[PDB]
C-alpha cells in the first residue's frame, strides 16, 4: 500500500513515488542521488492517530521514472512558504537536477 | 518534380496564435511549447526547451523568450542555466543569454518568468533554494542584476502602468515593489502594508491583473487587492467571493494559473469546486466564476471543464481555459462566457497557456 | 490531378496514412506538424537524403517514385504518426528502409517529422 | 526517525533481471533502458540513454554498454556520439567511450550493437549513411577500427563459437564475414555464396542464432541458413514454414527481433500474422510459431499477443515477448510455450528486450 498515493506518508507528495521506481520511501533508486534539501510535510497516521512531519526529499540525476505519479497536497503553501512548496524541483541544488523520484522520508512528531 | 523546403515561417497571422507550454512531466528533459491557431485547433509549430522550460512572447510580439536548464551530458555535466531568443514566425533560436545555475524549476506559473511592462528587460525567478529575482537586459543579451531584495518572496507581477516596475508576494503577506533603472539595478523599493495572513488565509499567487491594481483569491474563496496607481502600493480585503448557499458546499478556488480580469469590465474569471478542504487548492474546476471586481458580486458561473489554469485576451474578449491536455475557447464579451470549441491533444501535461500580444 | 498535389486535396484525406502517396512512411506527417507535404514545420531542416519507393495511385492507376525525406533539428513533432511499410526493406537494401532515421546526416539530427515528396511516373 | 540513502545495488539478483530499451519515440531525446525482474514483474531501475539509445550488458554480466547521440544544446551545437558503460549492479555511469558521429539512428534491432564472443570488443553498425561497422575495444576505452569493407551491408551476427569474429547480411544475398586480431583491427575476412534473393525473397535480418550456424526467416515464410561451423560459410535455403492450409490463409512472418532459437531442441520460434501482402512485414504477431529446425515442421501455433520482437533464454528455457509497451513471460521446456505472465507498461514504445547474462 506504500506504492499508493493515498498512503498517509505521501499526503505532499507531488511527483513519481520512488517506492515504484525501484527504490522504497527512504532509499533512492540505484543511480539516483538523494536531494540535501526537501519541501516538508505534516501528515496524520491514521494507524496510531498521531501527526508526524515528513521530509520530501527527491531522487536525482536521473531521467523521470515515470510510474505512480501523485499529487497531494495537504498543508502544502505557495512559494512565499517556501519549504512548504511542492510545485518546485528540490532536486534544484543537487550535482544534476534531472528530476528521477521522491520520497517521503519521517522525521518525527 | 516536388521539392521539400525549409525556412518557412507560421502560417497564420500573428493574432490568431496561442502557446501551449508543453512540460511532458514523463519526459520533463523534452519539455517544449506547441504554437496553436486558436480559431480553429490547427498546430503551427513548436519550440523544444529542454528541461522544465518555461516561455513567454516578447511584449512587442517578435521574439519568444524561453528559460530553460541544459546539461552536458543531461544527466551529468555542467549545468547552463539559459534564456533564449526565438524568432516568433520562423520558431528559430537566435540568442542565448547565460544565467546563473539557480533558475527556478518548477511549475509553469505566469509569475517565474515575466517582462517589465516596456519590453526592456526580462524578469525571472531564482531558487537555489535561497530566492532572489534575476534581471535580463534584453538589449545586451546579458544578466545585468541579482535582485537580493526579494530574498524570501516567490513570483513576478510586472506594473502595467510603468516601464520598469514589478511586484513579488513576500512571506510577511505584503508585497514588494522594486523599480528598476535603466540599467537594470534596483533604482527604488518599497514594502506594502500586510495584505493578507500566510497563516490564516493563504493567497494563490496568480493575480487578476488590471492595469493599475492586482486581485488575489485564497484558499478560502477571498479576495484581496493591490491598488498601485501610485508609487506606494495600497492594499486591501478580504471581501468573500462566497455567498451564503455557496458556503453550504464549502465553494474554494482551486487551480494553478486560476485567475484572470477583464480589463474593460472589472469581470475577475476564477475556477471553482465544492466540498473545499485541506488539500484540495489545486483541484479542477467544477464551475468557472465571473465575478464583479466592482459590486464584489458573482454575475455568472459556467461548468469548467476540469480546468486548471486560464489566460485572458483584452482585445478580443476571449479567455481560454487548459485542462491539462485540452484547451477552450471562450467567448467573455458578455458577462456569461460562451464556449467556441475545444482543440484537444494541444499538450500532455500542461498548466499554461498564452496568446500572441496584439 | 488534384489526387497529385496535396496542396489541393482536403487536409483530413492527406493528413492520414492511408493517403496513397504515404505507402512507405515511418514518422509524424509533417503536414500535421505546421508545415505541408512538402515544407518542413517552421525551424526544422530537410533531410538531403531519404529512403525512396514506389506507391499506387488508385485514382488515376499509375505508380509513383516517392522519396521519404525527413525534417531535422527539432524535437518530436508527435501528432500524425505513421508506420506503413509498402515495399520497405531491410538495411541491406539501405535507401529502401525506413527503420533509421533519415536526418542521420543533418547539421542536426534530432528527427522531428516525415513526409512523401512526389518525384515522378516509376 | 529515518535517513534517506543513495548508492544502492539493484534489489534482485542478476538471474531474474531483463532490460527493456524503451525508445519513447513521442520524445526520443529521452530514452532509457528499463531494468524489470520477469519472475514477478518489479521494476528494479533505469538507464538514461538521451536521443536513441541502444543497450547491451557485457559478456560477464558486469556491466551495461549504452550507445547514444548528444548535442550540446541537444537540438543544436555540436553531435557527440558516444558509448557508455555502466555498472550493472549500481546502474551508475562508468565511462564514455567518443565514436565518430556515425553510429545507427534506428529502432533496435539486436543486430546494430553486439560484442564479441570473447566480450573484448564492441561491434557497432555505423550509417553516414554509407555503412561500416565499428569496433570498441573495451579494455582501452578507444574506438579502434571502421570496416568499410562492409559497406553496403547491414547488421552484426557475432560467431558464438569463435572470439573475435561476425558476419554481417550484404546486398548481394550474401553474408561478409569478419575476423578481428587481437588488436580490434580486421586480420581476415570471406564472403558467403548467394544464401537469398534480395529481390525475390528478402530475409528479416534477426537471426535465429545457434553455436554455430544462424537461420533467418524471409518475407514470405521461407528459411535460409549460414553454417559457420567449418572455415568458410556454407548457406542454403529455402526451407518453407507454411504447410498447405498456412499457405491458402497467406501466413507470413512479421515483426522487427521477431525469431529466437532454441539451442537444445533445435527449436525456432517466429512471429506470424495471415492475409499476409506487401507492406504486412512489420504487422504484430497472430500467432507464434514453434518450428522443428530438423524436420521442418511446425510443433507449436499459439495466440501471439500482438507481440514484434522477442528474446530466448537458454539455461532457463524462456522466451519474452513484447508488444511495444508489454513483456510476455513463456516457459518453452516443452514444444507447446506456456504463459506464465505479463508485465503490463514496461515500455512506452519498445521494440527490444534481453536477459541479463548467466551461462
Excluded at chain 2, 531558487?127 to 541579482?146: L, M
Amino acid at each position: 500500500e506504500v506504492n499508493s498515493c493515498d498512503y498517509w506518508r505521501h499526503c505532499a507528495v507531488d511527483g513519481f513515488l520512488c517506492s515504484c521506481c525501484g527504490g522504497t520511501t527512504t532509499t533512492c533508486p540505484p543511480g539516483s542521488t538523494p536531494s540535501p534539501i526537501s519541501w516538508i510535510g505534516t501528515c496524520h497516521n491514521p494507524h496510531d492517530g498521531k501527526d508526524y512531519l515528513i521530509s520530501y526529499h527527491d531522487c536525482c540525476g536521473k531521467t523521470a521514472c515515470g510510474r505512480c505519479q501523485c499529487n497531494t497536497q495537504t498543508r502544502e503553501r505557495p512559494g512565499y512558504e517556501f519549504f512548504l512548496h511542492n510545485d518546485v524541483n528540490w532536486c534544484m541544488a543537487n550535482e544534476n537536477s534531472t528530476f528521477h523520484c521522491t520520497t517521503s522520508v519521517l522525521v518525527g512528531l | 518534380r516536388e521539392v521539400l523546403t525549409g525556412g518557412h515561417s507560421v502560417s497564420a497571422p500573428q493574432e490568431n496564435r496561442i502557446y501551449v507550454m508543453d512540460s511532458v512531466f514523463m519526459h520533463l528533459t523534452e519539455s517544449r511549447v506547441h504554437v496553436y491557431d486558436y480559431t480553429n485547433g490547427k498546430f503551427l509549430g513548436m519550440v523544444p526547451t529542454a528541461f522544465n522550460g518555461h516561455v513567454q512572447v516578447s511584449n512587442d510580439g517578435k521574439k519568444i523568450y524561453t528559460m530553460t536548464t541544459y546539461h552536458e551530458r543531461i544527466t551529468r555535466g555542467k549545468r547552463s542555466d539559459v534564456v533564449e531568443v526565438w524568432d516568433a514566425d520562423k520558431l528559430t533560436f537566435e540568442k542565448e543569454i547565460s544565467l546563473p545555475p539557480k533558475r527556478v524549476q518548477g511549475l509553469n506559473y505566469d509569475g517565474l518568468f515575466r517582462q517589465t511592462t516596456d519590453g526592456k528587460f526580462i524578469v525571472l525567478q531564482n531558487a537555489s533554494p535561497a530566492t532572489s529575482i534575476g534581471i535580463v537586459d534584453v538589449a545586451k543579451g546579458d544578466y545585468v542584476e541579482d535582485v537580493t531584495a526579494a530574498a524570501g518572496c516567490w513570483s513576478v507581477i510586472p506594473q502595467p502602468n510603468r516601464p520598469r516596475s514589478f511586484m513579488t508576494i513576500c512571506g510577511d503577506g505584503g508585497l514588494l515593489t522594486i523599480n528598476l533603472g535603466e540599467d537594470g539595478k534596483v533604482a527604488s523599493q518599497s514594502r506594502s502594508k500586510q495584505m493578507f495572513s500566510v497563516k490564516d488565509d493563504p493567497i494563490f499567487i496568480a493575480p487578476a491583473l488590471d492595469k493599475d491594481k492586482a486581485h488575489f483569491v485564497s484558499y478560502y474563496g477571498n479576495v484581496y487587492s493591490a491598488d498601485f496607481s501610485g508609487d506606494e502600493v495600497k492594499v486591501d480585503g478580504p471581501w468573500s467571493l462566497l455567498n451564503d448557499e455557496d458556503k453550504a458546499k464549502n465553494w474554494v478556488p482551486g487551480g494553478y494559473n486560476l485567475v484572470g480580469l477583464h480589463r474593460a469590465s472589472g469581470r475577475m474569471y476564477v475556477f471553482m469546486h465544492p466540498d473545499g478542504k485541506e488539500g484540495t487548492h489545486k483541484f479542477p474546476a467544477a464551475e468557472i466564476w465571473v465575478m464583479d471586481t466592482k459590486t464584489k458580486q458573482r454575475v455568472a458561473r459556467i461548468p469548467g471543464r476540469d480546468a486548471l489554469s486560464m489566460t485572458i485576451d483584452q482585445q478580443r474578449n476571449l479567455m481560454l481555459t487548459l485542462d491539462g491536455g485540452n484547451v477552450n475557447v471562450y467567448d467573455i464579451s458578455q458577462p456569461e462566457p460562451k464556449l467556441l470549441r475545444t482543440i484537444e491533444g494541444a499538450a500532455e501535461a500542461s498548466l499554461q497557456v498564452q496568446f500572441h500580444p496584439v
